[PDB]
Design a protein around this ligand. Structure first.
Ligand SMILES: Nc1nc2c(ncn2[C@@H]2O[C@H](COP(=O)(O)OP(=O)(O)O)[C@@H](O)[C@H]2O)c(=O)[nH]1
Length: 167
């Protein structure tokens, strides 16, 4: 199973994106070794995927689990909101923490600019493309409200993980 982690500042749509992905892609699978014989699973681009959201503020200011999410995750959606400059400024620290915890210079990641439906844009596409280029990763704009780009962001992350697992 591919282990995907959605990371970013609070209030940017991480939960909204993940819920929309599950809604579109969950299936009920027959498994007679499980108690009730059926389990829900998310399948993305033919791969069974596990999904987790990493917040560090709010209730998660009190959590002991940040580094554990980073060690377990195999690929990361690094999310900001296009109407939240601070959330964009927060990206670098998240990426640096992931790289430090995983002790790897090759961590599958996709940069995601959410809320692209909103007219109040303070982070330009070019700013985000430049950041993604520096990191060597894809950038995609999404809206959980209108659904634009949501599947594409996760499908792209799955391909990034697949390439990493190949070699
Ligand atoms: N306009 C708009 N609002 C969104 C979008 N995604 C999330 N929201 C709203 O942003 C707020 C925070 O979303 P949430 O999923 O709780 O963010 P989280 O803290 O990152 O998990 C909620 O009121 C959502 O309805 C989006 O793409 N567009």
């Amino acid at each position: 199973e591919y282990k995907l982690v959605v990371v970013g500042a609070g209030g940017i749509g991480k939960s909204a994106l993940t819920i929309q992905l599950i809604q579109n892609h969950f299936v009920d699978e027959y498994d007679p070794t499980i108690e009730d014989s059926y389990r829900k699973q998310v399948v993305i681009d033919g791969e069974t995927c596990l999904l987790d959201i990493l917040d560090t503020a709010g209730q998660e200011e009190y959590s002991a689990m940040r580094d554990q999410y980073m060690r377990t995750g195999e690929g990361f959606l690094c999310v900001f909101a296009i109407n939240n400059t601070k959330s964009f400024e927060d990206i670098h620290h998240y990426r640096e923490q992931i790289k430090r915890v995983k002790d790897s210079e090759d961590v599958p990641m996709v940069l995601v600019g959410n809320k692209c439906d909103l007219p109040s844009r303070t982070v330009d596409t070019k700013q985000a493309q430049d950041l993604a280029r520096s990191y060597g990763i894809p950038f995609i704009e999404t809206s959980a409200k209108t659904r634009q780009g949501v599947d594409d962001a996760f499908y792209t992350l799955v391909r990034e993980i697949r390439k990493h697992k190949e070699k």
